[PDB]
Design a protein around this ligand. Structure first.
Ligand SMILES: NC(=O)c1ccc[n+]([C@@H]2O[C@H](COP(=O)([O-])OP(=O)([O-])OC[C@H]3O[C@@H](n4cnc5c(N)[nH+]cnc54)[C@H](O)[C@@H]3O)[C@@H](O)[C@H]2O)c1
Ligand SMILES: NC(=O)c1ccc[n+]([C@@H]2O[C@H](COP(=O)([O-])OP(=O)([O-])OC[C@H]3O[C@@H](n4cnc5c(N)[nH+]cnc54)[C@H](O)[C@@H]3O)[C@@H](O)[C@H]2O)c1
Ligand SMILES: OCc1c(F)c(F)c(F)c(F)c1F
Ligand SMILES: OCc1c(F)c(F)c(F)c(F)c1F
Ligand SMILES: OCc1c(F)c(F)c(F)c(F)c1F
Ligand SMILES: OCc1c(F)c(F)c(F)c(F)c1F
Ligand SMILES: [Zn+2]
Ligand SMILES: [Zn+2]
Ligand SMILES: [Zn+2]
Ligand SMILES: [Zn+2]
Lengths: 374, 374
């Protein structure tokens, strides 16, 4: 048995920004009290993992990234009550401690134990479970799923259906849930409404899925890469527009197309300019715009607050507004019952060892989600 | 009789920015089709009228300003069905045409016939009813209440209770309804919540009234003028703070006081910096911040969109989100039924002839609302 013992395994270590991941041996300590060690089965490549590489999202290096994943519990530390060895699980990059003021609030999900706002790159106790070449290696969002084995805090893992297909449901750990919840829970898209979705990657496609599920009449996809349009239409876009095709700014185009502004817009890219454009294109008196994309570190946008004074609502969210531990098992159950589809998001599959090729696919524009198998 | 005839009467004409009003004779044309000519009884001095004088708010000059008022219908044009000669009325600076997409929307109030966004300073037909010294004089927001007589479009007037005291209920034309609605309708303040209100003038006091009516447990008033604190407490503030008293930024102070951020914040001043501060002091995952103050013309704010990504909601509104013609008569009826008080807002009552002295009281910090009586 490996329980209580250090595990040597392969992980994808990021030593430096703007460099390939290094697939090499790491030592994974056993779980301490209220920790869970997981044998990973599948992990997706989310653009936020690429943001770590590019320095868009600053987190301490060296690091084991990865946050969209599924696996099987190898062992549990003292006092763990919510999972057992052999359970299928999804790591939760947004924790749910259940005890803080946010966790107790009916509409909050950004648990105060998160490692997103001011990243330390550690476990909850301020230490790391990973060593590589004799050096400590940081965690990422308390999940670090780019490893054959990881250790997470109990508040950062959810037990899921034992019959779940892990190579699909890993997407419920980030991209699907984020986009779908941003539409259905955060924006609260209404039947018959007009939506505009900026960015047609895996998260933006999931936003479209949610807008269609909510009964939107028109769903306008916006992307500078027209190769993204066919899949966007397959999952519910009624029209797609490329800003590069127009002489006028796309907020003006979208306002014209919607006969005075859209009901709901979504920024699903991570650019300051498209955050302001997306706000502007929603109807000035009653429109709602949701920021989903992750902005470049420490940069401020500029905007005219008259856009809000007329009546617009601007908001953002992490993880689609879902309380993570409550929601993830229910989303898996709903997937099992065919309430939504994940296959449209999966364009490529690779072994974990080909992680760098998977990032190349994302960066070239060719993929939506690549799923890596351990 | 005056019906069908030009009326020569007294008005306060603003010939250029940053000068006193000129109190002099104007000619007021009779109402055309779908227009209403009103003998003014009382008008309040709102800070937004001062913004016209100061150039904070750009609108065509020369102008008869004034937008918070009540009077009695003198005559109606062909086709008017909603008011009759002798009726008490409140002019509506935000119209309610009942036909546009905003008027038809359950949550919109910023009717597309408004003259706020891109002010022309005219009647709906693009002409003016006012002349002074042989020159045409612009309207303001389709209201122009700083005159013994005005002409408004039918969509810009509401009939109110014949027994109403016009020297009080004029405040339902702007400041009371704006603040109260910003709390109860736009923010939707909840029972037991903690609110922060930036700016303790007539509008901010009305926000406090609404937060208390909604059952807030804590209402923190924020103003740099500590003379405003006593009245703020009288109408429901539980604490007041002056940013000038602190070594740290007030958003940090308010976050500390509220054990991690407030539920609802309101900017009721009109400064870019306090808009960002007010957003920041609301709880990062579930807080809501409402912009009420009118910012200086054509100036953008700068902010970090991570404030929204964590889960905050940022919105603004005109006139408390109330659909104006539906709401104003009901608010007057509610005042008549003792559901809220207006006297706490009224610090000074002056003849119309003292309009300049009233504006000086506002600018000096001394008054909340001066009511001018014709
Ligand atoms: N809020 C959250 O919880 C959360 C979760 C998951 C992802 N994210 C972020 O969401 C964003 C999208 O992630 P993803 O879907 O994996 O990324 P992605 O697959 O890279 O998709 C982004 C899309 O944006 C398109 N695009 C780039 N620039 C522009 C432009 N100027 N105008 C229009 N389209 C443009 C691009 O072609 C691509 O299809 C990233 O910033 C992620 O970091 C946020
Ligand atoms: N959205 C709307 O429909 C609407 C309606 C009515 C008024 N307004 C605007 O609302 C604002 C308030 O109007 P009002 O109550 O008549 O004005 P007011 O009576 O001048 O009150 C403003 C208050 O802000 C205080 N103040 C000024 N600077 C600061 C500062 N840096 N920090 C903290 N407090 C400060 C000031 O001392 C005063 O008590 C103005 O900008 C109006 O133009 C908007
Ligand atoms: O893709 C999800 C995601 C985010 F939305 C973030 F804001 C963030 F900081 C992060 F690390 C992350 F993984
Ligand atoms: O906070 C403790 C800690 C460190 F000090 C590191 F230098 C490091 F790489 C690490 F992973 C870690 F957890
Ligand atoms: O005080 C109400 C008020 C506003 F909130 C405005 F935004 C505006 F432009 C205006 F002219 C006005 F009178
Ligand atoms: O409304 C028409 C109108 C004008 F066309 C002006 F050029 C002007 F100065 C003015 F005050 C006015 F009211
Ligand atoms: Zn929590
Ligand atoms: Zn992600
Ligand atoms: Zn209208
Ligand atoms: Zn006003």
């Amino acid at each position: 048995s490996t329980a209580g013992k250090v595990i040597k395994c392969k992980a994808a270590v990021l030593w430096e920004e703007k460099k390939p991941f290094s697939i090499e041996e790491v030592e994974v300590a056993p779980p301490k009290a209220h920790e869970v060690r997981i044998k990973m089965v599948a992990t997706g490549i989310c653009r936020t993992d690429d943001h770590v590489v590019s320095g868009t999202l600053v987190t301490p290096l060296p690091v084991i990234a990865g946050h969209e994943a599924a696996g099987i519990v190898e062992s549990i530390g003292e006092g763990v009550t919510t999972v057992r060895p052999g359970d299928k699980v999804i790591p939760l990059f947004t924790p749910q401690c259940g005890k803080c003021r946010v966790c107790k609030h009916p509409e909050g999900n950004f648990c105060l134990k998160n490692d997103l706002s001011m990243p330390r790159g550690t476990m909850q106790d301020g230490t790391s479970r990973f060593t590589c070449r004799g050096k400590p290696i940081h965690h990422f969002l308390g999940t670090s799923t780019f490893s054959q084995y990881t250790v997470v805090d109990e508040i950062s893992v959810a037990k899921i259906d034992a019959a779940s297909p892990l190579e699909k449901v890993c997407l419920i750990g980030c991209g699907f849930s984020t986009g779908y919840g941003s539409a259905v829970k955060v924006a609260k898209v209404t039947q018959g409404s007009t939506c505009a979705v900026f960015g047609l990657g895996g998260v933006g496609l999931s936003v479209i899925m949610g807008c269609k599920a909510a009964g939107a009449a028109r769903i306008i996809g916006v992307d500078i890469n027209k190769d993204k349009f066919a899949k966007a239409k397959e999952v519910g876009a009624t029209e797609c527009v490329n800003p590069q095709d127009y002489k006028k700014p796309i907020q003006e185009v979208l306002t014209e197309m919607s006969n005075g502004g859209v009901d709901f817009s979504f920024e699903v890219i991570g650019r300051l300019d498209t955050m302001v454009t997306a706000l502007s294109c929603c109807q000035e008196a009653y429109g709602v715009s949701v920021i989903v994309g992750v902005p470049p570190d420490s940069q401020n946008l500029s905007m005219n607050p008259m856009l809000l004074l007329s009546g617009r609502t601007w908001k953002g969210a992490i993880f689609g507004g879902f309380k993570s531990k409550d929601s993830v098992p229910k989303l898996v159950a709903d997937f099992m019952a065919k309430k939504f589809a994940l296959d449209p998001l999966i364009t490529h599959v690779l072994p974990f060892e080909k992680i760098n090729e998977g990032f190349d696919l994302l960066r070239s524009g060719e993929s939506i989600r690549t799923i890596l198998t351990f």
